[PDB]
Design a protein around this ligand. Sequence first.
Ligand SMILES: NC(=O)c1ccc[n+]([C@@H]2O[C@H](COP(=O)([O-])OP(=O)(O)OC[C@H]3O[C@@H](n4cnc5c(N)ncnc54)[C@H](OP(=O)(O)O)[C@@H]3O)[C@@H](O)[C@H]2O)c1
Ligand SMILES: NC(=O)c1ccc[n+]([C@@H]2O[C@H](COP(=O)([O-])OP(=O)(O)OC[C@H]3O[C@@H](n4cnc5c(N)ncnc54)[C@H](OP(=O)(O)O)[C@@H]3O)[C@@H](O)[C@H]2O)c1
Ligand SMILES: NC(=O)c1ccc[n+]([C@@H]2O[C@H](COP(=O)([O-])OP(=O)(O)OC[C@H]3O[C@@H](n4cnc5c(N)ncnc54)[C@H](O)[C@@H]3O)[C@@H](O)[C@H]2O)c1
Ligand SMILES: NC(=O)c1ccc[n+]([C@@H]2O[C@H](COP(=O)([O-])OP(=O)(O)OC[C@H]3O[C@@H](n4cnc5c(N)ncnc54)[C@H](O)[C@@H]3O)[C@@H](O)[C@H]2O)c1
Lengths: 318, 318
Amino acid sequence: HKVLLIGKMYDEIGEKLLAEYTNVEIIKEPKQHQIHEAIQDVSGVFVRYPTKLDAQAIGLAKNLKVISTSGFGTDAIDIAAATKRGIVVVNNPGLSTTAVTEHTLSMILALAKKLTFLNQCVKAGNYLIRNQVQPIQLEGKTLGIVGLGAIGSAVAKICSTALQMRVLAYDPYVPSGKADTVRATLVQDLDYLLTESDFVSLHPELTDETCEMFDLEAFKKMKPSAFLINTSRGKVVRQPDLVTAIREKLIAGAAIDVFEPEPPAINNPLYEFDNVIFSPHLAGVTPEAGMAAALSAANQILQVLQGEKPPYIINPKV
Amino acid sequence: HKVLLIGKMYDEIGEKLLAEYTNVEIIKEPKQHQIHEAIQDVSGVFVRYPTKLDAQAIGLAKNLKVISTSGFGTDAIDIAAATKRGIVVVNNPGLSTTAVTEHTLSMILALAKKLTFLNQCVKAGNYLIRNQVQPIQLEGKTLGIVGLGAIGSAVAKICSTALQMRVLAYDPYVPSGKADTVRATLVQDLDYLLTESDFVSLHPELTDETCEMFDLEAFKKMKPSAFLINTSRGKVVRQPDLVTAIREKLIAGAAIDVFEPEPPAINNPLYEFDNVIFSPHLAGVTPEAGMAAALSAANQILQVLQGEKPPYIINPKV
Ligand SMILES: NC(=O)c1ccc[n+]([C@@H]2O[C@H](COP(=O)([O-])OP(=O)(O)OC[C@H]3O[C@@H](n4cnc5c(N)ncnc54)[C@H](OP(=O)(O)O)[C@@H]3O)[C@@H](O)[C@H]2O)c1
Ligand SMILES: NC(=O)c1ccc[n+]([C@@H]2O[C@H](COP(=O)([O-])OP(=O)(O)OC[C@H]3O[C@@H](n4cnc5c(N)ncnc54)[C@H](OP(=O)(O)O)[C@@H]3O)[C@@H](O)[C@H]2O)c1
Ligand SMILES: NC(=O)c1ccc[n+]([C@@H]2O[C@H](COP(=O)([O-])OP(=O)(O)OC[C@H]3O[C@@H](n4cnc5c(N)ncnc54)[C@H](O)[C@@H]3O)[C@@H](O)[C@H]2O)c1
Ligand SMILES: NC(=O)c1ccc[n+]([C@@H]2O[C@H](COP(=O)([O-])OP(=O)(O)OC[C@H]3O[C@@H](n4cnc5c(N)ncnc54)[C@H](O)[C@@H]3O)[C@@H](O)[C@H]2O)c1
């Protein structure tokens, strides 16, 4: 059996696991022709997010039996083309809770302390900015969490207890006792969260219900002094609404790690604003998180080649 | 009685407290001649850090009975000239523990997530940096704390419990039980802290013993992958040693909020490096912290004018 890695894994341990049982070829940032030639006789494919696996490549891969993404997202793979050939598409979700939690805290604190802005002011000799702008004390402020899942709960717990924040959570699919557990208050009215919050951090699953759930109307209800943090999925925010909200001062700032579409263009209208900070979809990509996802991707590839059913099938009908 | 504020307070509540009992004049970023004319008939003086109160101004102030700084630092005031005239010099220390704790966490997390760097990479269209640089997971890393006082203990507590870090503390004037209380380990050998730590955060009092205690030899013992965080006092670091340490990759980065001297010059050699981030001595300057220091400065000014002894006398011999 031969296996093709389109893009490197997040940690070489998954590659050595694969090399012990299959013939592996790795290609980095490939052109389409490289993909076409290397995929023809291969049994398994790994795809480093967010590069795309199209129907032409899938059709050219005569022996292909398993496709594994690098993380949770499967929007870059032509899943329909893979199910038509009966090819298993496999996921690697939920291995980066701690990484994203830490990343969310870093971005909440960064906005609160105005870190990126005050850094340039000092590097530009404007230390006298001490007399103009002031950092925000997180203690006693209200954090609003959209989505009280694995990451939302962990962020909720740290902010209420260690950082002494009041935390509200909006999540229609969770009991109020789950908020109590992490010292938060569940709220059924998103409006109450939006009007109450000094910081809003998005952690919901991307559904039809949450797609673009943060639009202009939401940004109007938010405090003008409040900040948005999005480490969930890019589609949760209606991007031009955020541009307008930032421009017209409907909110005070933003920190985002997830874009729509991905990769974002080099002329994205949000890059202009100084009160909007960015990270290139790395909240879940620490060495520890990458090692878990790499081992998970290798394992699910091997199990399919050995006929054992893997845990994270995206198209269980095949 | 008349009172002069050289620089604004960190919150207008101390000024309204003063105006209720005295005739107040406020001057912002003044030239020396403004200070000389406004100080002659005044009974009390407030000095916004870090502007200087020199012996000429103190000699021109015939009715001056109390000088209060804005915060802990008194190095900008000619204390010797004030004691020669029997003038009380008063401090306002210890009112910003929570502010500095939060600020230290923001800077530890910022360095760990490479925040300022990854922000420019996205704003410059280099989202593909995902494949080059990776953030650091704080869980299980070793934090070394120099100075287990009010702020050091609070930082220690949050990092060991909420952030799941291993914390070592070096502090010759503290029992090992104090480290146990915040889930840290006291270490008597600074070398052990330096060689063990992935992040070193400075929180000691500035003494002869701690002055420039972080020099080149210390930076050599630190891990090349480790980061320095300094929110204590600028004199704790030998500044050109840090420039050398950063240049020659003895440490991996730095986040500093306190300079030597203050204010720092516009051509400070550290501004060049991208792995060194800055804030203009604002770790203790949140609205909540400023309001406490402002009320404390007003109160100590009024008590001296009313002959009641204030709590934070710097020259108790007068
Ligand atoms: N973590 C972040 O990246 C982050 C988060 C929030 C805010 N910020 C930035 O921080 C700055 C402070 O804004 P704010 O939230 O405190 O509200 P603000 O009312 O805009 O700022 C308060 C004071 O700072 C002045 N100011 C604003 N921008 C300035 C600048 N570039 N240079 C010098 N002075 C400036 C304002 O003067 P004028 O009204 O005359 O301009 C005002 O006197 C803003 O530029 C904002 O974009 C950055
Ligand atoms: N919070 C912060 O501000 C902070 C903290 C730490 C590090 N940093 C910065 O982050 C960058 C990553 O450094 P590292 O700690 O991960 O060790 P590193 O070995 O210098 O970087 C690892 C990979 O990233 C590449 N790299 C370094 N700087 C780059 C740049 N400006 N643009 C594109 N690629 C770059 C390196 O390529 P080459 O070896 O060929 O250059 C190497 O392949 C460094 O520039 C460092 O100064 C920022
Ligand atoms: N930036 C990254 O690298 C990265 C890494 C991993 C995950 N993520 C994303 O972060 C987000 C959170 O991940 P997770 O592990 O906590 O997922 P999770 O499944 O554990 O929790 C998601 C929550 O969303 C809630 N939710 C569903 N509909 C909602 C709605 N209309 N309003 C509010 N909440 C709703 C669900 O009830 C659930 O509690 C996900 O979107 C995931 O794709 C990002
Ligand atoms: N950036 C800011 O805005 C700001 C604000 C307030 C305080 N600070 C500074 O932060 C630092 C910490 O403040 P704090 O309130 O916790 O003071 P603190 O008095 O409560 O604690 C200081 C600690 O330093 C310890 N120490 C003394 N000598 C030492 C040595 N050789 N090695 C290691 N430790 C030693 C003392 O035993 C004490 O525990 C101080 O230097 C203070 O001036 C900065």
